Structure 1
Amino acid sequence: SMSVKKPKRDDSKDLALCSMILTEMETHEDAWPFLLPVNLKLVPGYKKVIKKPMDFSTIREKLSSGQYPNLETFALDVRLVFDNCETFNEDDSDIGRAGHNMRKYFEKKWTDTFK
């Protein structure tokens, strides 16, 4: 509350560390459904159904330009990429399985780096 604060967690390396995680997600062999925005002209149903599209390139641009106020807003956009994928793709598809694999990979890196 006013003039009463928990001890200051060091957040000075968060930008760099989120960049490294994002590099490792970019270079994973199952990243290919997630590298670029879904083409809304060429994928019937996507625009109407997926209210907030998100992809790795868009997270990279937001990160590089100071559009994440903190490390949690960064994790929300990463998770959004996988929630969107589950919304549109069957579990038993190459893309559906890719999404599950990447989400696992992300959550471990996140825990090991920050928890």
Structure 2
Amino acid sequence: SMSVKKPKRDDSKDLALCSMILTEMETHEDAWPFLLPVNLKLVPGYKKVIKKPMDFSTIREKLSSGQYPNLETFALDVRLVFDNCETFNEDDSDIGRAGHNMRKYFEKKWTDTFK
């Protein structure tokens, strides 16, 4: 509350560390469905079904322009990529498996880096 604060966690490396995690995600061999925005002209259904499209390049641009207030908002956009993938793709599909793999990958790096 007012004038009563928990001890001050150091957040000054968070930007760099989130950038590193993103680089590791960008360069994974299963990243290919998530590197660029889905082409909303050429993919039927996507515009209507996926209310909040997200992809790594868009995450990269937001990161680099100071559009993430904190590391929790960054984790939400990353997760949103995989939740979107689950919504639109069958589990038994190259793209569906890519999403489950990439989620696992991210979640481990995140815990190892911050928890």
- Give your verdict on TM over 0.5: yes
CA distance in 1: counterparts of 2:14 and 2:65, whole angstroms: 15
May I ask how many residue pairs the two structures share in their alignment? 115
Deviations 1:69-114 (A, max 9, x none): 0000000000000000000000000000000000000000000000
Residue 61 of structure 1: SS of its match in structure 2?
A: helix
How far did residue 19 of structure 1 move? 0.1
SS of residue matched to 2:75: helix
Which string of whole-angstrom CA distances, capped at 9 and with x for unpartnered residues, describes residues 10-57 of structure 1? 000000000000000000000000000000000000000000000000
Q: TM-score, normalised by structure 1?
A: 1.00
TM-score by length of 2: 1.00
What stretches of structure 2 of length at least 5 have no aligned partner? none
Stretches of 4+ aligned residues off by more than 4 angstroms: none
The secondary structure found in structure 2 opposite 1:29 is coil
Structure 1 Cα separation of the partners of residues 4 and 32 of structure 2: 47
Unaligned runs of 5+ in 1: none
Question: 2: CA distance between counterparts of 1:27 and 1:79?
Answer: 17
**Seq. identity, %:** 100
CA RMSD of aligned residues (A): 0.2
Query: Cα distance, 1:61 vs. partner?
Result: 0.1
